[model samples]
Target chain A: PLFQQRPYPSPGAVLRANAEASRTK
Target chain B: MLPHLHNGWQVDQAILSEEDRVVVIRFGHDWDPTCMKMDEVLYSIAEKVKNFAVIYLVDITEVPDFNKMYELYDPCTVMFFFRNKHIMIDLGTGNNNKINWAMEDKQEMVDIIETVYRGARKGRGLVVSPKDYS
Candidate 1:
C-alpha cells in the first residue's frame, strides 16, 4: 500500500499524501 | 540564511525544546539555488519574526536522518511546528505539511510565518496561507 499507489498523481496529491504520511511519522 | 542544524538529534531537540514559539525549519541541500533563494527570504525575516517564531536550516546531505521521515525530497522544503506538534498549512499548493517551493518575497514569507505562529498560539494545528497557489 505504500509504493503501490498511483504511478502518476498530481504534484498536489503527491505532496498532500506525503504531508499526511510525515505528519504521523 | 540562519544557523544550520547539523544532525538529526539537533533537529529533534530544536522542535521539542521550543515551547513558546513556532519552529520553522528549511530542509534542503546547501548548494541548491532554490535553497539559496529560500534562505535569503528566511534570513531577511529572521529578526522581524524572532519574537513569535524561530527559523533554522538543515542540509539534507548533512543530516539525512529526517529525509525519509519528513518526505523531504524537494529542492527546498519548509515546515513548521509548535509545542512539538507539526503545524499544517493550506498554501493552495496542496501540500499542507510543508512548502516545497522557493518563496522569494520577504514580506510574504514573513506573513506566512506570522499566520502560522498566531494560529499555533490559538491551539490550532492547521492554518490557511495568505497566498493561494491554486
Candidate 2:
C-alpha cells in the first residue's frame, strides 16, 4: 500500500479525546 | 506503524546510533491527521530507502523532551540527521531544519530522502531538495 490513505482520527476528535482524558485524570 | 521513539533519551540515541544512513524522524502527535498522513508517506518509502535511511516516529505527547529544543510547533515535523549531526534541507521554506507539511506523494518523499542521504554521506550539513517545495 504505497501512499495509501489510512483511517485516522481528526485533530478535533483528538482534542476532544484529550479533554476527556484530562477529565478522567 | 513505523518504529516509535517513546522518550527523549531514545530520540537522542536514535540520532546518535546511526552510523552510515540518514536518520529521519517525525516529531508530532501520533493521532493527528497530518501526522498520520506523513507517516503513510514515510512508511511507504521506508523499505525502499532502508539501505540509506532509517525512519522513526516520535509522539510529542508521549515524549515532550525535544519539542521546545527542535521547535516542534508544526503538527508534523520531519527532520533528518546523519553521524550525530542535524542535516538541513533547502526546501525553499524558511525552516530548513525539517519538512513541516504533510508530503502525500511517496516518490517525491523518496527523492527527498535520497537527495539528503547522498548529501549527508558526502559530509554536507545541508542540501538542496531535488524539487523545490515552494
Candidate 3:
C-alpha cells in the first residue's frame, strides 16, 4: 500500500544550504 | 493541482511529446488523502521546474489501462519519463522504477525533480535521487 510506504528523508537542509548560498551571491 | 491526464492516449502523448522536459506522472486515486497531499507538493513545484519538468496526474480507477502494465497497484505511484523513455531513479528505497509512496516535503520533491531533469538532460535513463530512502 502506498500509505504504508514513507518517502526518503527530507532534503530540507540541502535546499536551505543552496538557498543561503544563492542569497550570499 | 497538476493537470490530470484523462485517458491513456493523453498520457502516452504527454510522455512522448515533451521533447525536452522530464515528464512526471502521479498515478493514484485523486480523492485519496495520500495523493491529495502529494498533489499539493507537486503543484507547488510545477512552476518552479516548468522549464525542465512537467507534472501530471492519473487516476488509476479512471484509466485502468496502465494498471497491469505499470504495476499501478499502490495507492499512489509517481513515475518519470524523458524524451519518450521512462526515467528510472534509485531512491535507495529498493524500487528504482517509480516512487510508490506519498512525499510530504515540497523541497524534497523539488530536489528530486531537479535531479531527474539534470540526469535526463545528460542523456541518462537512470538517475540517483537527491536523498536516499535507506
Candidate 4:
C-alpha cells in the first residue's frame, strides 16, 4: 500500500507532466 | 494504462478469496507514481509467494471514508493484516508514502503471512481462516 510520491497521479499523468515541464523549461 | 498493468494480481472479492497469510495493498485512483511503481514491484514478486501467500489490490479512494480514514492521502495505503489486527497507518491529509517493513523483503512479507496462518489475532468482522475457509 505504501508507495513513493512520483508527482504524477497516474501513468498517464506522469507522461503529461514530463511533456509540459519540458515545454516550459 | 500504466506500465506493468498486466500483473496477474486480482482484486479481493470479485477475483480471489481472502486467504491466510496474504498481503493487502489499498490504493487509490488518484495515486501517484510511487503507488504505481509499488504495485509493479509487489506484483513482480507475488508469484514467488503464491504458494504460501497472496496480494490484494484495493482502491480506497472510491470509498467514502477513505479521505477521513486515510486523512486525505490520495495515493495508497499498505496494511499488514491478520484477522482484525492490522499493522497499518493513519495516512493523514497528504501523500504519506512509505513501505512497511513487510513490503520490503519477500521473506519478511512471507514470514508475516505465516504468522497470520498460525492464527495470532482475532477480529469480530474478519472471520478466522481455515475456520472460514472450510
- Tens digits of per-residue lDDT, candidate 3, B1-134, equal 46888876777777767888988989998899888888888988889999999999998888776675567788889988887777778899878878888888888888898999889889887788878888
DockQ comparison, 2 vs 3, better candidate: 2
Cα lDDT over the full model 3: 0.79
Tens digits of per-residue lDDT for model 4, A1-25: 3563332132223334555767999
Question: Each model's C-alpha lDDT?
Answer: 0.80, 0.80, 0.79, 0.41
The local lDDT score (0 to 100) that residue B103 gets in candidate 4 is 38
Q: For model 3, how many clashes?
A: 0
Candidate 3 Cα deviation (angstroms), residue A9: 29
Instruction: Mark the regions of model 3 whose C-alpha exceeds 4 Å error after superposition.
Output: A1-25
Model 4 alpha-carbon drift over 4 Å, by segment: A1-25, B1-19, B70-74, B88-134
Assess candidate 1 and give its TM-score to the true structure: 0.82
> What local lDDT does model 4 show for residue A23?
100
CAPRI tier for the interface of model 2? incorrect
Off by over 4 Å in 2: A1-25
Model 1 CA lDDT for position B32:
97
Per-residue alpha-carbon lDDT of candidate 2 for residues B1-134, written as tens digits (9 for 90 to 100): 58998875677678768899988989897789999999988888899999999999999899875665567798999988888777778888766788999999899989998999999899887788888877
Judge candidate 4 at residue B128 and give its lDDT.
22
Model with the higher lDDT, candidate 1 or 3: 1
lDDT of 1 by residue, B1-134 (tens): 37888976687678778879998999897689999888888888899999999999998898776666577788999988887778888888756788888989889889998999999899988788998888
